[PDB]
Amino acid sequence: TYVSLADLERAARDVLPGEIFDFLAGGSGTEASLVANRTALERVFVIPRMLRDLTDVTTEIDIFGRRAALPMAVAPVAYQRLFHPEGELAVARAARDAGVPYTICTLSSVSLEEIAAVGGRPWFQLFWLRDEKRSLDLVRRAEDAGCEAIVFTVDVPWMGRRLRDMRNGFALPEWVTAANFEFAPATWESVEAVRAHTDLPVVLKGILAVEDARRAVDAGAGGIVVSNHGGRQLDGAVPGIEMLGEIVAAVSGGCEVLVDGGIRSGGDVLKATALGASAVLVGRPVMWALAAAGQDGVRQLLELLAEEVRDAMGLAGCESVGAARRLNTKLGVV
Amino acid sequence: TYVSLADLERAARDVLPGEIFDFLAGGSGTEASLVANRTALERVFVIPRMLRDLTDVTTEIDIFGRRAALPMAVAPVAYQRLFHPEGELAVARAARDAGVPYTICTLSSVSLEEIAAVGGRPWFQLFWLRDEKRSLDLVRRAEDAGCEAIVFTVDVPWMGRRLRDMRNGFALPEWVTAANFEFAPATWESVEAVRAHTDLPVVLKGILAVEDARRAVDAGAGGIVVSNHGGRQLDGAVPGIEMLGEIVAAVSGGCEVLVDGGIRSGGDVLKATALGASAVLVGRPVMWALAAAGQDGVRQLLELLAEEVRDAMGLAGCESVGAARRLNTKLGVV
Amino acid sequence: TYVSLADLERAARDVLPGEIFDFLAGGSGTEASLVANRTALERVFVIPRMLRDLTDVTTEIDIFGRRAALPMAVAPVAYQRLFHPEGELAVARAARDAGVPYTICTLSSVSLEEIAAVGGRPWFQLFWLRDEKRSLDLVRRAEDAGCEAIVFTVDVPWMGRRLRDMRNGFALPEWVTAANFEFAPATWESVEAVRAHTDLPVVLKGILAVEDARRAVDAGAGGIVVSNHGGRQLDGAVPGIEMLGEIVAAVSGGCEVLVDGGIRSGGDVLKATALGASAVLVGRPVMWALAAAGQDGVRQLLELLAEEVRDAMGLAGCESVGAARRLNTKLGVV
Amino acid sequence: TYVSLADLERAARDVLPGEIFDFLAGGSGTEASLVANRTALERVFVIPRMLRDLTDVTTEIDIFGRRAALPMAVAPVAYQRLFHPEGELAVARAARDAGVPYTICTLSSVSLEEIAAVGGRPWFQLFWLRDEKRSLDLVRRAEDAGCEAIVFTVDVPWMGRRLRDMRNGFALPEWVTAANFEFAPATWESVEAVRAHTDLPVVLKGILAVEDARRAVDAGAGGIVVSNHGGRQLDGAVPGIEMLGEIVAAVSGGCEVLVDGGIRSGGDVLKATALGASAVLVGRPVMWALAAAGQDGVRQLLELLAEEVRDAMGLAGCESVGAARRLNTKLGVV
Ligand SMILES: Cc1cc2nc3c(=O)[nH]c(=O)nc-3n(C[C@H](O)[C@H](O)[C@H](O)COP(=O)(O)O)c2cc1C
Ligand SMILES: Cc1cc2nc3c(=O)[nH]c(=O)nc-3n(C[C@H](O)[C@H](O)[C@H](O)COP(=O)(O)O)c2cc1C
Ligand SMILES: Cc1cc2nc3c(=O)[nH]c(=O)nc-3n(C[C@H](O)[C@H](O)[C@H](O)COP(=O)(O)O)c2cc1C
Ligand SMILES: Cc1cc2nc3c(=O)[nH]c(=O)nc-3n(C[C@H](O)[C@H](O)[C@H](O)COP(=O)(O)O)c2cc1C
Ligand SMILES: O=C(O)C(O)(O)C(F)(F)F
Ligand SMILES: O=C(O)C(O)(O)C(F)(F)F
Ligand SMILES: O=C(O)C(O)(O)C(F)(F)F
Ligand SMILES: O=C(O)C(O)(O)C(F)(F)F
C-alpha cells in the first residue's frame, strides 16, 4: 500500500535499471532548476479557511470543454515503454478510469491512435519538427483520433544537456521506438500555423516570462503551462511555481493557466491552485507508479492523489477548486 | 532533574512504545507544517528593554474571568492514558497545582466530570459531531461540571493524514477509550448554536486567516487560538506564529488571541507575547512530562516553564505580561 | 604561530578542563543568541572602495579622552584566573602593551587596584549590587585607581540560565574568588546615581532597543555597547550587530556606540565599523589566547587582530577608522 | 571527455601537488567571499523567453575594438607554470584558437612578449609597482607587443591574507619566476598616468562600489571588471555578481562592464549577461584545464563553455548576447 507519492519513487528506483531511472529523474546541467522546483513549493504555505460548508466537496474542474475529476492531468513524458512493457497504454487506461486527462506525446512509444483508442478524452503534445509538414500532420492525426487539446511544447528548440544521460551513455533500447514516425525551433509563426490548422484549443507548454504569457493569450492560445520542463531544459530557469501568481494576474482570465514541476502531493496541488493555477501537470510520479506496478500502480497513484486533494481542500475550507484559487498563501523559510 | 523541555522529550522517547511516541510526535503528510512551527519561532528574535523596575515581576494574567499563574494553558490532547496510566487526571492535578488552565478534551480517556472534579477551573475542548445534539450535550455537561470556557476546535472537519500512524497501523489499545461516550464539519452556524447554548466564553481553536479572526469576533467569540493544530491537520498550513501579529492587529482587542505550535521554552512564550498573544497553549511537552514521570513530571515541567517565563520576562525588562506584549521583535536567519 | 583567531580557540579547547571551556563558550538556554551573533556577522558583506591614498593607514581612534591603537577594547570577562594562573594581570599587561583598553570586571579574580597598577589606562565594568553603597564604592575605587570609564552592565538584573553550567554542576574552584569583595536589577535611577558619583564617562553595556539607546544619550551616557552579552543573558535576544545601524542613526553622534558579540577577525571589526560602530569589544577570543599561552598568547592575539584590521581597512580603501565608518554594506545569504 | 567544468576541477585536484592546488583554489581569511561568489550565482534564476527566431544564434561580441567568439575572456592568473610546464603559452594558444581574449599577467611566468607572439589579440593586466616607472614601462611593453587593452588591477594595494598558503608555507618553486622582471597602492592619479601613457582602452579590475564605477567612467576607463578578486583580497567583500545590476544601471553604457568570480558554466555566463554584463572573466577553471591536460585541456574547456553558452542562450530565446542582456532574472532560495 502506498501512502505518499514518495513511496512510489522508492519502488520505482528498486525496479528500474539505473540508466533508465536517471533518464526519468535527471535534469539539465547542475540540476539547479530540478531542485528549485521542489524548494519553491516547499517555501509556499497555505492560509486555510475554517467553518465553511463542506457538505459536497468536489475536486472537479471544467477545462478545454471537458469535466475532469481533479485539477490535474498526466504530463507528456516521452517513451513510456522504457518504464513498463505496457507503456503509454497502461497509463492512459488508468487516467481514463480516474477521470484525469492524459497527454499523448509526439515521442510516444505506442502510436497516438492506439493510445487515443483507450478513450478518456486525451490531449496531444506536439514538438515542432524540422519538417514542418510532419508537425502539422501530427496535429491532424491527433484531432482525427479524438484528442481534445494540442499541448504545443515551446521550450525545446533542442534538448537540454542531460549530464546523467551523457555520463551513462544512455540510449533507447532497440525495443523502444518513436511509434508516431529532428527538433526545429518553434516560433510564434509556428503557433499561428497550428492554431489555423485545428479547431482544438492550443496550449503552450513551457512559458515562464509574463510577456510571453500575455502574448500567448493575444496569439489565441486556450491555455499555457507555466513550466521549466521539470528542470530538464535551461539549467537556471526559474521554477514555474515562482512565476505563476504574476502570470495569472497578467492574463486576467484570458486563458487557462496550468503549472508543473515538482507536484508531489495533493497539498502541492492545493498550493498551485491557491497561487492561481487552473490545474497542474504531474510527470515523474506517474512514471514511478507505472514502473512499480503498471496500470494498477498508476490507478493507485491517482486514487492517492485524489484522496490527498480532497483532504487538503476540505482542511483548507474549500468545497470547490474555485474556492481553492481564492485562498491566500504566505512564503516561509524551510 | 530537567533543565529544558528537551530533556523531557528524551525521557518520553525512552519510555513510550514507538507507535505511541509517533502518535504524539507526528504530523500530517510530509510534516512540513510540524517542522515549520519550530522554524518560525526560531526566526523571531526579541528586542529586550533594560533598566526597568523589576521589583515585582509577575507572570500572571487574567483570562476568561480567572487569574492564571502564567500566560499559558495545557492544550487539548486526546487520549492521555496512552502516555501514563493516570492520564488526564495526572495532568489536570499538576495544572491545578501550578495555577495553569487545563483543557479537557472531547476525546478524553477519563470522563470530563472526573477531570473537572480535580478542580483548578478547567476549560473544555469541543469537537462538532455528526449527531449535533451530542455536541451540544457535551457543552452542557462541561458547563454543569464547572468548566470555564468552551474551546471549539474549528480545524478538524475530519482528521488529517497521519502517515506515521498509517505506517505503524496504529490503533488505540483496548484499555484506552473515549470516556465521554463521528466528526462532522463545523460551520459558523455551529459556532452560533454553541454560543446560544452556553454562558461560557467560546474560543475558536484553529484560526489562521485574518478574515476568520475578524469573523470570530463578529460571531461573539471570547477568544481564538491561532494554530495549525501542531502540524497535524493541513500539511502546508502556515504556522500560527507567522499569522499572529497580523491577526492581533485585525481584531484590535475584540477577543483574546492565543497561539500554539512548537512552544518549547519560556523564551518561546516571550516571543509569542511580544508578537501580541494573550497566552499560549502547550501540547506535546506536557505529554512528554506525563509519559516520563506522571503527575510529578508534569509538575516539574510547569515549574521549569514558570522559571523560564519569569527569567525571560525580567531579562527583557518586563514586570508584567502586558509589558511583554509591547516588546518589539526582529526576524533573523537561522 | 596563530594565523586566525580560530587557531586560538582550538588551542584553548585542548588545555582547559571541559567545564571551564563550557563556562567560557556557553550561552543561555538553547544558545540561539550565541549562534545568531555569528550568523548575523556572516550575512554582512562590505562594499570596499578602491584607489584611495593609503600612504598612512592608521587604525587608531580617540575614545573617552584617550587614543587607542585599534577600534577595539577587551570586553569584561569575569574570573580570568579560571583560564590561566596570571588571570587578569596577564591580559591587562598584553592590552597595555598593544595600546588597547582593558575592561576590569566587578567579578575580577585579581583586585581592581592591582590590575589598574599594570597601567594602560583601563576601564571598569560595574554590576549593580543589592547593597547599592557597595556598587558606588566600587565606582569610587575604580576612579581613584585611574580607570578611565565606567562600563555599567545593564543587561544582568540576574544571570541567565546557563544550561552547560547546570549540566556540568560548574562552580568556581576554591582558588578563584571575586577579589574586589548579590546582583540587584539596575534602573535608570541607578544610572543617574553613578553619573552623579563620578567624573568619568559612563558607558551602558547591553543596550539593544533603539529607544533605550536614545534614553542613554538623554541620561548623560558617554557611550553604549550594543550587545546581547554574548548570548549569555536572554536566549532569543537579537544580536547587537543587527540593531547597530538603527541605533547609530538614532543617537546621531550623541554618544560613542560600541558593539560586541562574535567579533572573530579584523574583517569582522571592519563590518562593525562600516555599520557605524565607534569600536568593538572582544571577549571569548582574548580568553582563548590567555588559556593557550598566557600573556604572550594575548599579545599574539592582539598583534594578529591589529594586522587583520590594518589589512581589511586598506583592502577596503580606508586610511582611517572614520573612513571605514562611511563604507556601505550589503546583506547576503550564507 | 569532460561534460562540465567540475569534471576539470576533479582532474586538476588529482594531478597537482596539494600546496599548488591550494594556491589556486584558496581565498583570503575565512574564505567567506570565495564561497559567496558561488552562493550569489546559485541564487539567481533566469526568466527565459520562448518562440523567438534562433536561425542564427551567435555568441560573439565586439569589445575593445575586436570581435570575440564568446562574451568571455581568460582572467589574469599569476604564475601559470605552477600548473603545467607550458604555462601561459598553452593557455594563450588555446584562447587564440577559440577566439577568446587572454589576459597576460604582470606576474606571468613566461615573458609578456613571448605570450603576445602566440597571437590572438591578448590583453595585459597591470599591477602598480613601488617603482612607478616600472609599471609604465610594462604598459609600453605590452602596447608595443600588440596587447589590445590594459587591465589595471585596482584591488591589490597589497596581497590579501591567504591562510592556506601560510599554513602550507607555500613559496614559488625555483623553476617558476616573474618573467617580466613590490606592490604599491594605486590611486586615481595612477589611473590617469596610465591613461595618458597609452592609446589602449584601460579597464579597471576590482570595482565593487557604485561610486567607483561612476568615477571609472569619469576617469576615462573603457571598461571595469566588477570583482572581489575571486575572494582572494578582502575577506567579506561583496561578490561582484551582487553589485553588477546596480553598477550597470549607474554607468548607463559609459563603459563596458565585465564581471568575474565563480563563473562555472555557460548558464552562469547567461546569468551574468542577464544581470547586464558585457562579458565575464573565468579564472580557476582555465587553470584546472591547464593542469589536467595542458593546451588540449584548455581547448576542451573552451569548447565545452562555448557549447554551454550557445545552449543556454538558445534555451532562453536569445539569438545574440544583446538579447541575453535584456533577459530578466529572479532571486530564489537554494
Ligand atoms: C522522462 C521525461 C520525459 C519528458 N518528455 C517530455 C516531452 O516529450 N514533451 C514535453 O512537453 N515534456 C516532457 N517532459 C516534461 C514533463 O511534461 C513535465 O514538464 C515535467 O516532467 C513536469 O515535472 P514533474 O516531473 O516534476 O512532475 C518530460 C519529463 C520527463 C521526466
Ligand atoms: C497527540 C495529540 C492529540 C491532540 N488532540 C487534540 C484534540 O483532540 N483536540 C484539539 O483541538 N487539538 C488536539 N491536538 C492539538 C493541540 O491542542 C495543539 O494545537 C498542538 O499539539 C499544539 O502544539 P504543540 O504540541 O507543538 O505544543 C492534539 C495534539 C497532539 C500532539
Ligand atoms: C565567560 C564570560 C564572562 C563574562 N563576564 C562578564 C561580566 O562579568 N560583565 C559583563 O558586562 N560582561 C561579561 N561577559 C560578556 C562580555 O563582556 C561580552 O559582552 C561577550 O563575551 C562579547 O562577546 P564575544 O565573547 O562573542 O566576543 C562575559 C562573557 C563571557 C564569555
Ligand atoms: C591563482 C590565482 C592567481 C591570480 N592572479 C591574479 C593577478 O595576478 N592579477 C589579477 O588581477 N587577478 C588575479 N587573480 C584573480 C582572477 O583574475 C579572477 O578575478 C578570479 O580568479 C576570478 O574568479 P574565478 O577564479 O572564480 O573564475 C588570480 C586568481 C587566482 C585563482
Ligand atoms: O525532456 C525530454 O526528455 C523531452 O522533452 O522528451 C525532450 F527530449 F524532447 F527534450
Ligand atoms: O490531532 C488529533 O489527534 C485530534 O485532534 O484528536 C484528532 F484526531 F481529532 F484530529
Ligand atoms: O556572563 C557572565 O558570566 C557574567 O556577566 O559574569 C554574569 F555572571 F554576571 F552574568
Ligand atoms: O591573487 C593573487 O595571487 C595575485 O593577484 O597575483 C596577487 F598575488 F597579486 F594578489
Side-chain angles (χ1 to χ4, degrees):
Chain A
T1 186
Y2 308 112
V3 300
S4 78
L5 272 54
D7 286 343
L8 293 157
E9 189 184 16
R10 291 179 276 274
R13 193 189 298 260
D14 281 351
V15 306
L16 292 169
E19 78 181 353
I20 289 175
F21 189 81
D22 279 339
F23 175 66
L24 181 56
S28 63
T30 67
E31 298 185 340
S33 291
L34 175 65
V35 169
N37 286 348
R38 284 301 307 159
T39 304
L41 272 162
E42 291 173 351
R43 281 200 315 146
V44 174
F45 291 75
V46 173
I47 306 173
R49 298 299 299 259
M50 302 299 154
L51 296 169
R52 299 163 55 104
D53 182 8
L54 300 175
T55 297
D56 204 25
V57 175
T58 167
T59 64
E60 297 186 333
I61 62 163
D62 293 303
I63 191 162
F64 311 136
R66 72 165 275 174
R67 191 86 99 205
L70 289 171
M72 175 266 187
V74 177
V77 173
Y79 300 124
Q80 290 170 24
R81 277 177 38 69
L82 285 168
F83 311 117
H84 188 281
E86 294 173 1
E88 292 84 357
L89 292 180
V91 185
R93 284 165 180 151
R96 169 199 65 201
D97 288 351
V100 171
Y102 175 80
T103 308
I104 298 171
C105 289
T106 284
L107 302 174
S108 57
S109 55
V110 176
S111 75
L112 71 88
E113 288 83 5
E114 285 165 84
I115 302 161
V118 161
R121 310 170 69 178
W123 299 347
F124 181 72
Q125 173 271 335
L126 177 69
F127 282 128
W128 201 245
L129 303 158
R130 293 276 171 210
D131 186 357
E132 147 156 12
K133 269 179 87 62
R134 165 82 281 212
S135 288
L136 285 199
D137 179 65
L138 285 171
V139 169
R140 181 54 52 74
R141 284 171 65 181
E143 192 164 3
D144 283 349
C147 293
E148 312 216 311
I150 303 297
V151 178
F152 192 169
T153 301
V154 305
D155 61 358
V156 188
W158 53 76
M159 172 177 341
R161 287 182 58 82
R162 314 285 175 74
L163 304 192
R164 302 189 196 202
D165 292 356
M166 296 180 195
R167 286 167 173 149
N168 288 334
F170 178 68
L172 293 177
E174 57 92 15
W175 68 82
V176 175
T177 67
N180 295 326
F181 296 90
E182 191 86 301
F183 291 130
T187 64
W188 292 105
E189 291 197 30
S190 320
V191 172
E192 175 53 24
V194 170
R195 194 213 50 80
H197 194 71
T198 185
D199 291 316
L200 297 180
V202 175
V203 178
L204 304 187
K205 172 173 184 282
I207 301 287
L208 289 169
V210 175
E211 305 79 12
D212 286 344
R214 285 196 196 95
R215 183 152 182 188
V217 179
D218 295 330
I224 58 179
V225 189
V226 181
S227 175
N228 68 12
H229 209 107
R232 295 174 69 87
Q233 286 299 101
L234 174 67
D235 186 37
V238 61
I241 202 70
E242 293 274 352
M243 302 303 301
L244 176 59
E246 192 173 1
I247 282 171
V248 168
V251 302
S252 193
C255 67
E256 300 288 356
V257 180
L258 294 85
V259 68
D260 74 12
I263 303 295
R264 301 295 178 259
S265 69
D268 289 342
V269 176
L270 187 73
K271 289 172 180 193
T273 54
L275 291 170
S278 300
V280 303
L281 311 180
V282 181
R284 294 171 181 102
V286 180
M287 304 299 111
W288 299 337
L290 172 66
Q295 183 187 331
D296 193 63
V298 183
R299 174 191 66 80
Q300 285 178 73
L301 163 73
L302 298 178
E303 285 180 0
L304 173 59
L305 275 170
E307 179 51 30
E308 290 176 347
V309 171
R310 164 181 213 282
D311 175 62
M313 284 177 58
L315 295 179
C318 294
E319 207 184 27
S320 64
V321 175
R325 290 184 69 262
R326 294 187 300 272
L327 292 168
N328 293 127
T329 54
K330 188 161 252 269
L331 297 178
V333 304
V334 188
Chain B
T1 186
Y2 308 112
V3 300
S4 78
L5 272 54
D7 286 343
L8 293 157
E9 189 184 16
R10 291 179 276 274
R13 193 189 298 260
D14 281 351
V15 306
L16 292 169
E19 78 181 353
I20 289 175
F21 189 81
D22 279 339
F23 175 66
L24 181 56
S28 63
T30 67
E31 298 185 340
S33 291
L34 175 65
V35 169
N37 286 348
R38 284 301 307 159
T39 304
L41 272 162
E42 291 173 351
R43 281 200 315 146
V44 174
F45 291 75
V46 173
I47 306 173
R49 298 299 299 259
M50 302 299 154
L51 296 169
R52 299 163 55 104
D53 182 8
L54 300 175
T55 297
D56 204 25
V57 175
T58 167
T59 64
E60 297 186 333
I61 62 163
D62 293 303
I63 191 162
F64 311 136
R66 72 165 275 174
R67 191 86 99 205
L70 289 171
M72 175 266 187
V74 177
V77 173
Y79 300 124
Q80 290 170 24
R81 277 177 38 69
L82 285 168
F83 311 117
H84 188 281
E86 294 173 1
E88 292 84 357
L89 292 180
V91 185
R93 284 165 180 151
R96 169 199 65 201
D97 288 351
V100 171
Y102 175 80
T103 308
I104 298 171
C105 289
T106 284
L107 302 174
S108 57
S109 55
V110 176
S111 75
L112 71 88
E113 288 83 5
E114 285 165 84
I115 302 161
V118 161
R121 310 170 69 178
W123 299 347
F124 181 72
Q125 173 271 335
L126 177 69
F127 282 128
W128 201 245
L129 303 158
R130 293 276 171 210
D131 186 357
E132 147 156 12
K133 269 179 87 62
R134 165 82 281 212
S135 288
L136 285 199
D137 179 65
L138 285 171
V139 169
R140 181 54 52 74
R141 284 171 65 181
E143 192 164 3
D144 283 349
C147 293
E148 312 216 311
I150 303 297
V151 178
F152 192 169
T153 301
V154 305
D155 61 358
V156 188
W158 53 76
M159 172 177 341
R161 287 182 58 82
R162 314 285 175 74
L163 304 192
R164 302 189 196 202
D165 292 356
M166 296 180 195
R167 286 167 173 149
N168 288 334
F170 178 68
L172 293 177
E174 57 92 15
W175 68 82
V176 175
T177 67
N180 295 326
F181 296 90
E182 191 86 301
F183 291 130
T187 64
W188 292 105
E189 291 197 30
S190 320
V191 172
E192 175 53 24
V194 170
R195 194 213 50 80
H197 194 71
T198 185
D199 291 316
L200 297 180
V202 175
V203 178
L204 304 187
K205 172 173 184 282
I207 301 287
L208 289 169
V210 175
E211 305 79 12
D212 286 344
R214 285 196 196 95
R215 183 152 182 188
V217 179
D218 295 330
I224 58 179
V225 189
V226 181
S227 175
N228 68 12
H229 209 107
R232 295 174 69 87
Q233 286 299 101
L234 174 67
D235 186 37
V238 61
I241 202 70
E242 293 274 352
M243 302 303 301
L244 176 59
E246 192 173 1
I247 282 171
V248 168
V251 302
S252 193
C255 67
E256 300 288 356
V257 180
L258 294 85
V259 68
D260 74 12
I263 302 295
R264 301 295 178 259
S265 69
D268 289 342
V269 176
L270 187 73
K271 289 172 180 193
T273 54
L275 291 170
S278 300
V280 303
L281 311 180
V282 181
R284 294 171 181 102
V286 180
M287 304 299 111
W288 299 337
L290 172 66
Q295 183 187 331
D296 193 63
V298 183
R299 174 191 66 80
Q300 285 178 73
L301 163 73
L302 298 178
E303 285 180 0
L304 173 59
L305 275 170
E307 179 51 30
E308 290 176 347
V309 171
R310 164 181 213 282
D311 175 62
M313 284 177 58
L315 295 179
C318 294
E319 207 184 27
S320 64
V321 175
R325 290 184 69 262
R326 294 187 300 272
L327 292 168
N328 293 127
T329 54
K330 188 161 252 269
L331 297 178
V333 304
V334 188
Chain C
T1 186
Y2 308 112
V3 300
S4 78
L5 272 54
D7 286 343
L8 293 157
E9 189 184 16
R10 291 179 276 274
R13 193 189 298 260
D14 281 351
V15 306
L16 292 169
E19 78 181 353
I20 289 175
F21 189 81
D22 279 339
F23 175 66
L24 181 56
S28 63
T30 67
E31 298 185 340
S33 291
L34 175 65
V35 169
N37 286 348
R38 284 301 307 159
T39 304
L41 272 162
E42 291 173 351
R43 281 200 315 146
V44 174
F45 291 75
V46 173
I47 306 173
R49 298 299 299 259
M50 302 299 154
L51 296 169
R52 299 163 55 104
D53 182 8
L54 300 175
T55 297
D56 204 25
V57 175
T58 167
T59 64
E60 297 186 333
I61 62 163
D62 293 303
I63 191 162
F64 311 136
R66 72 165 275 174
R67 191 86 99 205
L70 289 171
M72 175 266 187
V74 177
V77 173
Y79 300 124
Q80 290 170 24
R81 277 177 38 69
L82 285 168
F83 311 117
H84 188 281
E86 294 173 1
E88 292 84 357
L89 292 180
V91 185
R93 284 165 180 151
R96 169 199 65 201
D97 288 351
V100 171
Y102 175 80
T103 308
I104 298 171
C105 289
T106 284
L107 302 174
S108 57
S109 55
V110 176
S111 75
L112 71 88
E113 288 83 5
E114 285 165 84
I115 302 161
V118 161
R121 310 170 69 178
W123 299 347
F124 181 72
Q125 173 271 335
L126 177 69
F127 282 128
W128 201 245
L129 303 158
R130 293 276 171 210
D131 186 357
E132 147 156 12
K133 269 179 87 62
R134 165 82 281 212
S135 288
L136 285 199
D137 179 65
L138 285 171
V139 169
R140 181 54 52 74
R141 284 171 65 181
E143 192 164 3
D144 283 349
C147 293
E148 312 216 311
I150 303 297
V151 178
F152 192 169
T153 301
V154 305
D155 61 358
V156 188
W158 53 76
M159 172 177 341
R161 287 182 58 82
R162 314 285 175 74
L163 304 192
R164 302 189 196 202
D165 292 356
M166 296 180 195
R167 286 167 173 149
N168 288 334
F170 178 68
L172 293 177
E174 57 92 15
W175 68 82
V176 175
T177 67
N180 295 326
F181 296 90
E182 191 86 301
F183 291 130
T187 64
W188 292 105
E189 291 197 30
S190 320
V191 172
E192 175 53 24
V194 170
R195 194 213 50 80
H197 194 71
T198 185
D199 291 316
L200 297 180
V202 175
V203 178
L204 304 187
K205 172 173 184 282
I207 301 287
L208 289 169
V210 175
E211 305 79 12
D212 286 344
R214 285 196 196 95
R215 183 152 182 188
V217 179
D218 295 330
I224 58 179
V225 189
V226 181
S227 175
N228 68 12
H229 209 107
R232 295 174 69 87
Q233 286 299 101
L234 174 67
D235 186 37
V238 61
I241 202 70
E242 293 274 352
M243 302 303 301
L244 176 59
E246 192 173 1
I247 282 171
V248 168
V251 302
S252 193
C255 67
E256 300 288 356
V257 180
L258 294 85
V259 68
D260 74 12
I263 303 295
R264 301 295 178 259
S265 69
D268 289 342
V269 176
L270 187 73
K271 289 172 180 193
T273 54
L275 291 170
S278 300
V280 303
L281 311 180
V282 181
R284 294 171 181 102
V286 180
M287 304 299 111
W288 299 337
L290 172 66
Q295 183 187 331
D296 193 63
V298 183
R299 174 191 66 80
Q300 285 178 73
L301 163 73
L302 298 178
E303 285 180 0
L304 173 59
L305 275 170
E307 179 51 30
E308 290 176 347
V309 171
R310 164 181 213 282
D311 175 62
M313 284 177 58
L315 295 179
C318 294
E319 207 184 27
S320 64
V321 175
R325 290 184 69 262
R326 294 187 300 272
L327 292 168
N328 293 127
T329 54
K330 188 161 252 269
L331 297 178
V333 304
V334 188
Chain D
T1 186
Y2 308 112
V3 300
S4 78
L5 272 54
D7 286 343
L8 293 157
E9 189 184 16
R10 291 179 276 274
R13 193 189 298 260
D14 281 351
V15 306
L16 292 169
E19 78 181 353
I20 289 175
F21 189 81
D22 279 339
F23 175 66
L24 181 56
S28 63
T30 67
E31 298 185 340
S33 291
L34 175 65
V35 169
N37 286 348
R38 284 301 307 159
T39 304
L41 272 162
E42 291 173 351
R43 281 200 315 146
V44 174
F45 291 75
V46 173
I47 306 173
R49 298 299 299 259
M50 302 299 154
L51 296 169
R52 299 163 55 104
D53 182 8
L54 300 175
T55 297
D56 204 25
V57 175
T58 167
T59 64
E60 297 186 333
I61 62 163
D62 293 303
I63 191 162
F64 311 136
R66 72 165 275 174
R67 191 86 99 205
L70 289 171
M72 175 266 187
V74 177
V77 173
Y79 300 124
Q80 290 170 24
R81 277 177 38 69
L82 285 168
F83 311 117
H84 188 281
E86 294 173 1
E88 292 84 357
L89 292 180
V91 185
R93 284 165 180 151
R96 169 199 65 201
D97 288 351
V100 171
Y102 175 80
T103 308
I104 298 171
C105 289
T106 284
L107 302 174
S108 57
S109 55
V110 176
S111 75
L112 71 88
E113 288 83 5
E114 285 165 84
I115 302 161
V118 161
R121 310 170 69 178
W123 299 347
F124 181 72
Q125 173 271 335
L126 177 69
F127 282 128
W128 201 245
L129 303 158
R130 293 276 171 210
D131 186 357
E132 147 156 12
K133 269 179 87 62
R134 165 82 281 212
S135 288
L136 285 199
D137 179 65
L138 285 171
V139 169
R140 181 54 52 74
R141 284 171 65 181
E143 192 164 3
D144 283 349
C147 293
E148 312 216 311
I150 303 297
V151 178
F152 192 169
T153 301
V154 305
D155 61 358
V156 188
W158 53 76
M159 172 177 341
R161 287 182 58 82
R162 314 285 175 74
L163 304 192
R164 302 189 196 202
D165 292 356
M166 296 180 195
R167 286 167 173 149
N168 288 334
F170 178 68
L172 293 177
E174 57 92 15
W175 68 82
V176 175
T177 67
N180 295 326
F181 296 90
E182 191 86 301
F183 291 130
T187 64
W188 292 105
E189 291 197 30
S190 320
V191 172
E192 175 53 24
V194 170
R195 194 213 50 80
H197 194 71
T198 185
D199 291 316
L200 297 180
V202 175
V203 178
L204 304 187
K205 172 173 184 282
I207 301 287
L208 289 169
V210 175
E211 305 79 12
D212 286 344
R214 285 196 196 95
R215 183 152 182 188
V217 179
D218 295 330
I224 58 179
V225 189
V226 181
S227 175
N228 68 12
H229 209 107
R232 295 174 69 87
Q233 286 299 101
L234 174 67
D235 186 37
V238 61
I241 202 70
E242 293 274 352
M243 302 303 301
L244 176 59
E246 192 173 1
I247 282 171
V248 168
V251 302
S252 193
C255 67
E256 300 288 356
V257 180
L258 294 85
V259 68
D260 74 12
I263 303 295
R264 301 295 178 259
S265 69
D268 289 342
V269 176
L270 187 73
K271 289 172 180 193
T273 54
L275 291 170
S278 300
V280 303
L281 311 180
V282 181
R284 294 171 181 102
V286 180
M287 304 299 111
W288 299 337
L290 172 66
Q295 183 187 331
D296 193 63
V298 183
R299 174 191 66 80
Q300 285 178 73
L301 163 73
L302 298 178
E303 285 180 0
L304 173 59
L305 275 170
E307 179 51 30
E308 290 176 347
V309 171
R310 164 181 213 282
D311 175 62
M313 284 177 58
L315 295 179
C318 294
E319 207 184 27
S320 64
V321 175
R325 290 184 69 262
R326 294 187 300 272
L327 292 168
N328 293 127
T329 54
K330 188 161 252 269
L331 297 178
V333 304
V334 188

